[PDB]
């Protein structure tokens, strides 16, 4: 089965492409606590439909470019801007923690 | 190349009769008469209190020297036993008792176990119609053990078998002195053997 994932769109910034943020949960292999990781995916949005803050489905596809292996299958829920918010803040915190 | 050298000395050191000579270990020559004390200069001095280790060691050595086999074979046989479904100590004693040389001793073909080994090694002994020259051969239930067709002439064999008239063999065995054969009926129970060895003490020896 072509893999299907579910994510929020954290980036509108490219042409015909969205950055889709996909969380994942699982027991830590030793310590056992359920831990939640995440991965950004570049997905193909040709019709430029999917906006910032959309929870969409992503599907494994024939490679569109380097780094784009997925397409945007459907819009599951619109307007989750808080997810985007957490993403942007996590990013912004990088500005500390160097020199 | 198992222990080869004076046997009644182990009779002495282990502090109990283990019959490695068969006959004469029956008579009052065994040296256990007049020398129940262990061998050497100090053997007649006061014993100290044996450490747990010491106890278990010597118990295992008792069990081993009884069967004449090497520690390699002994240990390997033990591990074999500890794998098998069912109580190790018994199973071990049962696999020990199934050695062809042993079975030959047990059947009364040979006065002692070492002699039984030689009879086996020299092919005087057949299992299930075929010659078997390996002392370590494992006799399974139902296997017939006989003196070989030709070796039947040997004055030693005719001797021992003549002495085996009227003597009863073990209950897990059967003996027909007429065809000089006999059957290994089933694996002997701990209770079946008279062995002066606490085996659960040997089990504890490998537990280290």
């Amino acid at each position: 089965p072509k893999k299907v994932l579910t994510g929020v769109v954290v980036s509108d910034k490219m042409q015909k492409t969205v950055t889709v943020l996909v969380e994942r949960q699982f027991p830590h292999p030793l310590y056992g606590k359920v831990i939640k990781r995440s991965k950004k995916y570049l997905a193909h949005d040709p019709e430029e439909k999917y906006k910032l803050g959309d929870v969409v489905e992503i599907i494994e596809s024939r490679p569109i470019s380097k780094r784009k292996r997925f397409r945007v299958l459907r819009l599951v829920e619109s307007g989750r801007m808080d997810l985007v918010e957490k993403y942007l803040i996590r990013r912004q915190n990088y500005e500390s923690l160097s020199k | 190349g198992r222990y080869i050298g004076p046997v009644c000395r182990l009779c002495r050191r282990e502090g109990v009769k283990l019959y490695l000579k068969g006959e004469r270990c029956y008579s009052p020559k065994c040296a256990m008469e007049r020398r129940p004390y262990p061998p050497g200069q100090h053997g007649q001095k006061r014993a100290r209190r044996p450490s747990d280790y010491a106890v278990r060691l010597r118990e295992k050595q008792k069990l081993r020297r009884i069967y004449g086999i090497s520690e390699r074979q002994f240990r390997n046989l033990f591990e074999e036993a500890s794998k098998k479904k069912g109580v190790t100590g018994s199973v071990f004693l049962g696999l020990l008792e199934s050695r062809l040389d042993n079975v030959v001793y047990r059947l009364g073909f040979a006065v002692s176990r070492r002699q039984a080994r030689q009879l086996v090694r020299h092919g005087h002994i057949t299992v299930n119609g075929r010659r078997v020259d390996l002392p370590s051969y494992r006799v399974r239930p139902g296997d017939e053990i006989a003196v070989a067709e030709k070796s039947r002439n040997l004055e030693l064999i005719r001797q021992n078998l003549e002495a085996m008239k009227g003597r009863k063999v073990g209950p897990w065995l059967s003996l027909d002195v007429e065809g000089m054969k006999g059957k290994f009926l089933r694996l002997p129970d701990r209770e079946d053997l008279a062995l002066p060895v606490n085996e659960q003490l040997v089990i504890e020896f490998y537990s280290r």
């Binding site: 310590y31 056992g32 606590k33 359920v34 | -």
Partner: protein, 138 residues
């Protein structure tokens, strides 16, 4: 706010029994009730009842002890020797059916929460389901 109401209830029981209280009030909830019912059926407690303290729901739990003893320290044996949360918030343990543990060679119990409901170890095995492993008791 209790951070783990279940651990809190178990602990209340533990403390209660350790001083030989006749009974102890835990703040009421359905899940707590199911755990109790299991204990009561298993004989670790005499029982429990619902009660309003300060017009608030609580479960009053009636503990159970041994007969008085002899020599110095006449204090009786505990019926609950051991009561322990396994899965806690912050590490949640879940077991499959093949993994539901035998407690104290059967003399104890484990309580699981399953999609068949709250069971004991034996209950879960016989029902053939696993779930979250709540606590050990013995």
């Amino acid at each position: 706010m209790l951070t783990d109401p279940i651990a809190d209830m178990l602990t209340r029981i533990r403390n209660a029994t350790r001083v030989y209280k006749e009974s102890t009030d835990v703040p009421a909830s359905r899940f707590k009730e199911e755990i109790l019912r299991i204990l009561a059926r298993e004989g670790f407690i005499k029982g429990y009842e619902r009660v309003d303290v300060d017009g608030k729901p609580y479960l009053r739990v009636y503990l159970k002890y041994g007969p008085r003893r002899q020599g110095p320290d006449p204090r009786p044996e505990q019926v609950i020797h051991h009561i322990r949360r396994i899965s806690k918030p912050g590490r949640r343990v879940y077991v499959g059916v093949k993994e539901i543990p035998r407690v104290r060679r059967g003399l104890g119990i484990a309580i699981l929460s399953t999609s068949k409901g709250v069971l004991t170890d034996r209950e879960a095995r016989k029902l053939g389901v696993g779930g979250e492993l709540i606590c050990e008791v013995w």
